[PDB]
Amino acid sequence: DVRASLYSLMVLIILTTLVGNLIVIVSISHFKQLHTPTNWLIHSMATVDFLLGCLVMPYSMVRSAEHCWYFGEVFCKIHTSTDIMLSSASIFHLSFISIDRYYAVCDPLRYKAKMNILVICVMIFISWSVPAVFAFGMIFLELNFKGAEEIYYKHVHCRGGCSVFFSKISGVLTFMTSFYIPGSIMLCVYYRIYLIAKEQARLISDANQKLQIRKAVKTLGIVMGVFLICWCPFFICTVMDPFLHYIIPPTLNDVLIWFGYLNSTFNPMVYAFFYPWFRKALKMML
Amino acid sequence: ELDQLRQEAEQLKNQIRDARKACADATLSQITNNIDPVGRIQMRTRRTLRGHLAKIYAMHWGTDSRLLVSASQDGKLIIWDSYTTNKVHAIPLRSSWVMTCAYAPSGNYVACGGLDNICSIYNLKTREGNVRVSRELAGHTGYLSCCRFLDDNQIVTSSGDTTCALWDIETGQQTTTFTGHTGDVMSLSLAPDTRLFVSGACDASAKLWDVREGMCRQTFTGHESDINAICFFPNGNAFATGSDDATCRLFDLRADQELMTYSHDNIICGITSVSFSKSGRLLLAGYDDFNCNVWDALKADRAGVLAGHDNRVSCLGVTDDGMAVATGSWDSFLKIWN
Amino acid sequence: RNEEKAQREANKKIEKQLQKDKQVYRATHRLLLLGAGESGKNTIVKQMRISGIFETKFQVDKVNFHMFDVGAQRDERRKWIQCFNDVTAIIFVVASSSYNMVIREDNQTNRLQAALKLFDSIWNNKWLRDTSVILFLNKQDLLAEKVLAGKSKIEDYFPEFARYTTPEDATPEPGEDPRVTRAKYFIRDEFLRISTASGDGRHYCYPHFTCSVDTENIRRVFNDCRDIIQRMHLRQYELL
Amino acid sequence: TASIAQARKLVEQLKMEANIDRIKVSKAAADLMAYCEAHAKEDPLLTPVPASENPFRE
Numbered sequence: 004d005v006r007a008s009l010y011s012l013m014v015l016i017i018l019t020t021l022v023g024n025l026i027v028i029v030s031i032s033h034f035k036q037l038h039t040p041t042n043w044l045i046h047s048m049a050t051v052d053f054l055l056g057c058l059v060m061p062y063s064m065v066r067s068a069e070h071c072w073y074f075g076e077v078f079c080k081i082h083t084s085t086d087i088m089l090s091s092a093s094i095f096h097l098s099f100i101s102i103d104r105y106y107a108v109c110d111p112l113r114y115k116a117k118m119n120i121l122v123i124c125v126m127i128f129i130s131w132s133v134p135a136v137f138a139f140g141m142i143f144l145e146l147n148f149k150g151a152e153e154i155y156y157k158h159v160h161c162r163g164g165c166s167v168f169f170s171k172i173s174g175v176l177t178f179m180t181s182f183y184i185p186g187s188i189m190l191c192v193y194y195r196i197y198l199i200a201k202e203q204a205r206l207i208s209d210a211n212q213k214l215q216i217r218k219a220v221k222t223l224g225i226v227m228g229v230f231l232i233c234w235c236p237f238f239i240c241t242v243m244d245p246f247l248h249y250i251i252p253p254t255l256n257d258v259l260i261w262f263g264y265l266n267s268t269f270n271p272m273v274y275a276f277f278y279p280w281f282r283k284a285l286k287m288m289l
Numbered sequence: 290e291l292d293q294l295r296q297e298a299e300q301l302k303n304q305i306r307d308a309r310k311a312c313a314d315a316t317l318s319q320i321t322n323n324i325d326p327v328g329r330i331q332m333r334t335r336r337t338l339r340g341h342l343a344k345i346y347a348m349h350w351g352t353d354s355r356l357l358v359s360a361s362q363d364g365k366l367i368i369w370d371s372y373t374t375n376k377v378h379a380i381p382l383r384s385s386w387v388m389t390c391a392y393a394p395s396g397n398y399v400a401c402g403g404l405d406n407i408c409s410i411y412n413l414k415t416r417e418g419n420v421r422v423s424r425e426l427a428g429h430t431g432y433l434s435c436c437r438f439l440d441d442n443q444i445v446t447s448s449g450d451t452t453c454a455l456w457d458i459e460t461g462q463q464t465t466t467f468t469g470h471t472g473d474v475m476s477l478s479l480a481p482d483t484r485l486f487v488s489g490a491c492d493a494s495a496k497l498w499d500v501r502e503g504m505c506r507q508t509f510t511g512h513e514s515d516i517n518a519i520c521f522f523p524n525g526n527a528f529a530t531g532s533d534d535a536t537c538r539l540f541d542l543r544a545d546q547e548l549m550t551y552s553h554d555n556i557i558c559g560i561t562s563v564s565f566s567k568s569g570r571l572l573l574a575g576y577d578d579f580n581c582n583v584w585d586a587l588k589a590d591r592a593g594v595l596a597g598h599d600n601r602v603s604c605l606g607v608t609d610d611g612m613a614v615a616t617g618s619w620d621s622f623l624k625i626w627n
Numbered sequence: 628r629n630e631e632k633a634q635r636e637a638n639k640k641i642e643k644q645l646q647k648d649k650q651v652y653r654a655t656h657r658l659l660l661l662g663a664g665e666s667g668k669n670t671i672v673k674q675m676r677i678s679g680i681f682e683t684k685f686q687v688d689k690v691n692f693h694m695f696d697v698g699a700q701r702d703e704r705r706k707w708i709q710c711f712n713d714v715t716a717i718i719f720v721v722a723s724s725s726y727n728m729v730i731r732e733d734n735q736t737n738r739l740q741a742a743l744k745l746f747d748s749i750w751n752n753k754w755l756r757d758t759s760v761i762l763f764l765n766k767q768d769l770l771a772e773k774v775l776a777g778k779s780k781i782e783d784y785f786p787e788f789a790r791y792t793t794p795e796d797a798t799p800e801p802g803e804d805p806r807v808t809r810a811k812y813f814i815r816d817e818f819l820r821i822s823t824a825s826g827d828g829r830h831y832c833y834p835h836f837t838c839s840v841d842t843e844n845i846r847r848v849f850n851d852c853r854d855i856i857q858r859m860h861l862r863q864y865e866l867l
Numbered sequence: 868t869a870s871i872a873q874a875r876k877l878v879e880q881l882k883m884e885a886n887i888d889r890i891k892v893s894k895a896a897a898d899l900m901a902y903c904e905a906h907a908k909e910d911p912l913l914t915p916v917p918a919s920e921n922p923f924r925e
């Protein structure tokens with residue numbers, strides 16, 4: 004009935020995300036003409052998405068399907084920590100790609116001398132490391148609820164699935180460490196790039212119009228709209244819940260958490276398959 | 290006397306076509322047809338030599354194999370070891386445009402020079418383990434296109450001033466000058482006898498010079514575009530020539546005529562390099578469409594494709610003993626096949 | 628064995644040197660300097676300093692430029708031009724005060740017509756189809772002295788000068804005389820027309836007014852290279 | 868003139884070119900084909916050798 008359709012759409016999501024991420028990984032790894040350091044960041048993001056598709060989403064799927072947790076508490080803790088690490092990894096990779104494009108299209112002369120493989124390797128290391136420590140410290144060191152315990156024991160008085168509980172301080176700490184800073188950086192960088200592109204396009208248009216006798220807004224808009232629509236509502240609800248008295252039905256929460264997965268699905272079709280050179284290389288594979 | 294000169298020359302040349310055509314009685318394709326096909330010879334890449342930073346323009350095997358030297362646009366004349374894929378020398382050039390490269394027949398000297406107008410000689414072995422320039426041959430007025438070693442004390446150079454000159458490296462002074470070409474020459478292949486060589490210019494022609502008397506003896510025509518590469522037959526009776534019209538030709542020094550020709554309608558690019566194997570039955574050739582076809586020297590049937598490169602193949606050379614082929618490309622990777 | 632160790636150590640030394648040379652090689656830009664013999668290429672090169680290629684290495688704003696005088700080569704069929712398919716720009720020095728002066732070959736036409744033919748050949752070359760051209764124009768004061776002091780006018784040698792009006796973009800900041808700016812902006816029109824006939828947004832042309840001895844040429848080259856590389860980067864990400 | 872002199876020199880070179888001996892293409896083709904099996908026994912490239920003599924093993 005409803006559950007069968009739910010399984011159909013969800014397994015479609017897992018299969019499509021796995022296929023896309025695997026294709027991107029294989030295309031970047033096998034070819035030798037695509038080895039510039041930016042493609043290494045793209046490949047790392049693709050592997051993050053592939054792991055996120057291979058590990059957590061089946062169990063989230065079954066949980067959301069039957070609203071019950073047929074597993075152990077330690078397994079649930081592992082699941083939660085892995086989910087928190089693998090979302091922050093993707094967000095950090097998006098922010099680093101944005102910074103790379105900023106250096107590319109704002110300081111053209113000193114681009115290949117400041118974006119060497121060492122900097123990209125350090126970027127990947129700091130992208131994979133900090134989320135791991137942060138998530139495992141919050142979950143295993145029982146720090147997400149350490150502030151208050153009476154509310155937590157009221158929270159576990161009912162239901163019985165392992166839902167993530169965030170205090171008034173832990174919630175704001177998570178909000179201002181995984182969403183706010185990368186979002187602000189992406190906003191500023193892409194606004195500056197938009198201004199520069201607009202000025203250059205206007206000059207070119209003027210010159211060619213005189214001698215004769217908007218891709219920037221269509222490109223940056225797609226990326227920013229996808230990222231914002233897929234991430235913002237979830238983090239807004241997550242941060243607002245602790246301040247209120249937790250009166251938000253999970254019927255919103257499951258959709259919000261599935262938007263993040265859907266974003267992870269929509270990454271290689273905005274960062275890899277949208278540019279002409281990647282499609283040319285893939286066709287040359289044939 | 291101008292009109293008399295023109296009429297006499299044109300009558301003599303009309304006679305010389307008749308003389309060439311009189312010798313012809315059949316074709317080599319008809320003569321060999323009754324020979325079994327070569328087969329489906331297949332080559333698998335063994336090792337890849339990496340370390341260059343730009344597009345290789347030349348390479349040259351040593352005298353006893355196991356060594357090869359390559360020149361790039363970076364300005365490094367790296368000398369590899371062909372068994373351990375290691376490096377023995379990293380001689381840094383002065384000019385950053387070299388289009389020639391020539392390992393000495395004895396293993397002592399290396400020559401390299403391009404748009405600098407100067408041919409330089411490098412001394413590999415000295416009292417200490419350091420390589421330094423020994424001489425700088427000057428006197429040309431155009432870009433160097435080819436240079437080959439005749440012995441330890443003589444070098445032959447082919448430049449862009451439409452002249453070929455023979456040098457003598459003890460004093461840096463010319464000995465003989467070969468003139469008569471209209472366009473620029475970009476191919477200079479010596480002969481095993483070390484007494485004759487040919488040059489292929491851009492005028493779609495080729496000549497046979499003599500090192501002993503210093504004047505032309507044979508004029509070969511038949512192409513419709515510039516000549517990119519040339520190479521003798523192991524026996525020493527014929528040579529192969531490549532052009533920009535996707536055509537390969539096997540001229541003859543005995544009958545003074547164009548013999549059987551290679552062609553294929555699916556290729557529209559230009560030949561870049563041509564060489565023969567030891568026996569003289571396989572004729573490898575390069576192409577601008579990113580592969581290296583291998584022809585049959587007798588029946589003209591493609592016996593394989595040496596694909597695996599990413600950009601244009603610029604130069605290739607078959608080793609002396611015959612157990613190794615190597616192709617350089619603009620991919621900055623040398624690939625030593627088998 | 629001991630033989631292997633020496634070879635491995637030598638290979639390690641060579642790789643260590645090649646790493647430094649790779650680090651050095653990525654921070655330099657290569658520029659060609661095609662031009663006419665009588666034009667002031669030598670003066671500009673000597674200023675940047677303070678028998679074929681005479682490569683000169685200068686430096687401005689912590690970046691290194693690598694510039695090449697290639698005037699020693701011969702004429703026609705231009706087969707060396709294939710190699711310079713990775714440079715950033717092609718400086719093109721042309722002397723404007725040569726409308727009357729004729730090259731040594733009396734049969735040959737005016738030097739300006741030869742410069743136009745060379746520019747057409749360079750611009751329409753199939754190999755140089757993705758590189759911009761930084762067009763210069765030297766001998767500015769000589770042209771002014773020629774035009775002001777009567778003598779043979781441009782109409783004698785250039786017939787179309789009569790059907791010409793000064794454009795609306797002319798900015799005579801020095802404000803010397805309006806009879807010179809007319810010819811100065813007329814000279815640009817031929818090269819711009821040669822440049823605008825082809826196109827499709829793959830390579831541009833940056834004209835300039837300068838003298839042989841004056842400064843700011845390095846700054847102009849710097850700005851033009853910045854703009855060229857910025858547009859090249861912008862067009863990869865499907866932004867421009 | 869000098870151009871006439873160099874044209875005359877080219878004509879003399881052509882007349883030297885014309886006075887050479889020739890041969891039938893059939894004999895040259897036969898010689899080439901005979902050499903094409905005379906040393907074809909070696910053929911380290913045309914006839915593959917077992918993977919024990921080649922110094923280029925994986």
Ligand SMILES: CNC[C@@H]1OCCc2ccsc21
Binds near residue numbers: 087264
């Ligand atoms: C896909 N869900 C994201 C994950 O859900 C648990 C809480 C949290 C905080 C930052 S990312 C995150």
